[PDB]
């Protein structure tokens, strides 16, 4: 924190586990919520979660913003309705100033060449319109799930659109 | 900071004239006018008094000492010449005068008895050229048709008997605030031919501003100008020097900040001086008192200060400022600002301290 020089893509690939080790584990609980198995897809009421932005939310971003989300999805009696889906994973690894590579801004260090930033965190990135994490059930209430994501958004760097079913 | 000293009086030059010139005058209704709204003579040093407390809500209604203070010697003073002023835009400008054929026999210096032949130095107010009326007419006509402005009178305090003073009289015009105008204009005309005293505009208990040039030395350093901090020890040995004054684009500093210059001298009024007493020197007593033509009530034995004994008309202005000092000339006023209400025609004045200054 804060996430600033973290989620703007001004770099290019990898993740690559070959290349990198010492990746921190994600603190993003399972990306399968609600009752799985049965096809939730048969449902009235629909979806949400549209990013409306560019990218790279960190696992710190998604994992408390998503279960936060689920927490107020609990209202629908624990195990009784909806499945929650998350889309993208936090693959993508980021490195931060370890003074040896270059100079100035991050992904630059001291000297020239040298320490790339040391591994510290991972974040998935997204596009202008992608569905961050969706799923629904019949209109349980007015739309508790719609209330969900109200809270879900408001912990994402992006401005997420609710998007109607 | 707070800033040292206080802007207010500015720039802080020397003082032109060693006579105060009141900027403002009381504004009045139900008034004569005085002509001599201001009237003054000047300082002798002073002792203290025991006074009955006046009329407070407070319990103290008994003897209590206040600095009966700097008794100044006044008066009588004469107003020779009421001067009209009339018409703007611009500002006030004199009209014509009046006159007086009385001429205190000493008002030559700084006045009359100038050499008949012109002198390089400008001549002061002297007159043998007289037109009492004409002046009166000029004023009256420039009343109905044009205008007029507040009228005042010349005044001159005589040194009938003061320690070390002379025929020289240094007097300045004091304004008369009557009712409409024309009523008052009449008043200043009556008190023209004639003379006055403090017991005219005045009253014990009544509050008055007092004005005069402070006594004081010439240029001094920052510390005892507006106060400034001395030190620190380095240039401690040297005179107190304030940190650099202003630094930036203007090389010079207007500053408004701590500069060496003249001090002493002044010209500043004080506000709401109470006038505890009025007085005299002639003997008057409710009961038997000393005889053999005793002297003034309040003058210390041993005289007071350099210029001693008082034996004539006095005034006591408590908590003496006086806004100047020894044998100078303060000017009285009326209390323009006022705060507390007036007290009484007289104060009890149970005791006055008479003792040689030294000792």
């Amino acid at each position: 924190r804060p996430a600033r020089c973290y989620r703007y893509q001004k770099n290019k690939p990898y993740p690559k586990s070959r290349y990198n080790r010492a990746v921190p584990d994600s603190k993003i609980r399972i990306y399968d919520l609600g009752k799985k198995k049965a096809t939730v897809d048969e449902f009235p009421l629909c979806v949400h979660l549209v990013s409306n932005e560019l990218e790279q939310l960190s696992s710190e971003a998604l994992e408390a913003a998503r279960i936060c989300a689920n927490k107020y999805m609990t209202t629908v009696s624990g195990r009784d309705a909806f499945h929650l889906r998350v889309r993208v994973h936090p693959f993508h690894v980021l490195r931060i100033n370890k003074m040896l590579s270059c100079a100035g801004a991050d992904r630059l260090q001291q000297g020239m060449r040298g320490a790339w930033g040391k591994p510290h965190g991972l974040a998935a990135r997204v596009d202008i319109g992608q569905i961050i994490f969706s799923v629904r059930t019949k209109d349980s209430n007015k739309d508790v799930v719609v209330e969900g994501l109200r809270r879900a958004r408001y912990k994402f760097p992006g401005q997420q659109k609710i998007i109607l079913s | 900071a707070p800033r040292h000293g206080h802007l207010g009086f500015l720039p802080r030059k020397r003082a032109a004239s060693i006579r105060a010139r009141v900027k403002a005058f009381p504004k009045d209704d139900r008034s004569k006018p005085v002509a001599l709204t201001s009237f003054l003579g000047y300082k002798a040093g002073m002792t203290t008094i025991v006074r009955d407390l006046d009329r407070p809500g407070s319990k103290f209604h008994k003897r209590e000492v206040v600095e009966a203070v700097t008794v100044v010697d006044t008066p009588p003073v004469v107003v020779v010449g009421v001067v009209g002023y009339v018409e703007t835009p611009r500002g006030l400008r004199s009209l014509t005068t009046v006159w007086a054929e009385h001429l205190s026999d000493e008002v030559k210096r700084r006045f009359y008895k100038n050499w008949y032949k012109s002198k390089k130095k400008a001549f002061t107010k002297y007159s043998a050229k007289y037109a009492q009326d004409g002046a009166g007419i000029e004023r009256e006509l420039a009343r109905i048709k044009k205008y007029a402005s507040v009228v005042r009178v010349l005044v001159h305090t005589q040194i009938r008997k003061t320690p070390l003073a002379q025929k020289k009289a240094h007097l300045a015009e004091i304004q008369l605030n009557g009712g409409s105008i024309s009523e008052k204009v009449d008043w200043a005309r009556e008190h023209f031919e004639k003379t006055v005293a403090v017991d005219s505009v005045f009253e014990q208990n009544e509050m008055i501003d007092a004005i005069a040039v402070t006594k004081g030395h010439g240029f001094e350093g920052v510390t005892h100008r507006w106060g400034t901090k001395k030190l620190p020890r380095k240039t401690h040995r040297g005179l107190r020097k304030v940190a650099c004054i202003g630094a930036w684009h203007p090389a010079h500093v207007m500053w408004s900040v701590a500069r060496a210059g003249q001090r002493g001298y002044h010209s500043r009024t004080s506000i709401n001086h109470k006038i505890y007493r009025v007085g005299k020197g002639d003997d008057e007593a409710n009961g038997a008192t000393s005889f053999d033509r005793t002297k003034k009530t309040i003058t210390p034995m041993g005289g007071f200060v350099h210029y001693g004994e008082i034996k004539n008309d006095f005034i006591m202005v408590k908590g003496c400022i006086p806004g100047n000092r020894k044998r100078i000339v303060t000017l009285r006023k009326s209390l323009y600002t006022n705060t507390s209400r007036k007290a009484l025609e007289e104060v009890s004045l149970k005791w006055i301290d008479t003792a040689s200054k030294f000792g």
Binding site: - | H249, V253, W255, S256
Partner: protein
């Protein structure tokens, strides 16, 4: 007094629109005065008008010391100043037609004859659907001491 050429009223009248005229005309040569400075109005108000202006709350006055600059307090100066803007006051026919213009304080104009309005720079303050609170002149310079 000053010789008028075309004296101009300025009552309900937007100030700049007037002084953006007489400071054109002034330039050409014309001599004269606007009166009713005092009722001469600029729109938008009762706030960022009091401030960023000359009130003793505007702090325009009492702004500084030996550096200035100082502004004006009277309705005369206040939009006299406006006149200097829109003129190359410093030099040439600048401070020329500049001097040759005066604004007068006034209730109905102090000089005998009503002076002309300008090409429509009028308040039109009546059933101001387009109008809103706009009040200035004396009032700004009244909150500030005269």
């Amino acid at each position: 007094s000053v010789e008028p050429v075309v004296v101009i009223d300025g009552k309900g009248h937007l100030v700049g629109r007037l002084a953006s005229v007489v400071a054109k005309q002034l330039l050409n040569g014309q001599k004269i005065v606007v009166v009713r400075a005092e009722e001469l109005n600029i729109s938008g108000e009762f706030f960022r008008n009091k401030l960023k202006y000359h009130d003793f709350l505007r702090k325009a006055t009492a702004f500084n010391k030996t550096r200035g600059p100082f502004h004006f307090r009277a309705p005369s100066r206040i939009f006299y100043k406006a006149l200097r803007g829109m003129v190359s006051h410093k030099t040439a026919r600048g401070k020329a037609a500049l001097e040759r213009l005066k604004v007068f304080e006034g209730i109905p104009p102090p000089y005998d004859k009503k002076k002309r309005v300008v090409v429509p720079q009028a308040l039109r303050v009546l059933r101001l659907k387009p109008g809103r609170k706009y009040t200035t002149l004396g009032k700004l310079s009244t909150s500030v001491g005269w």
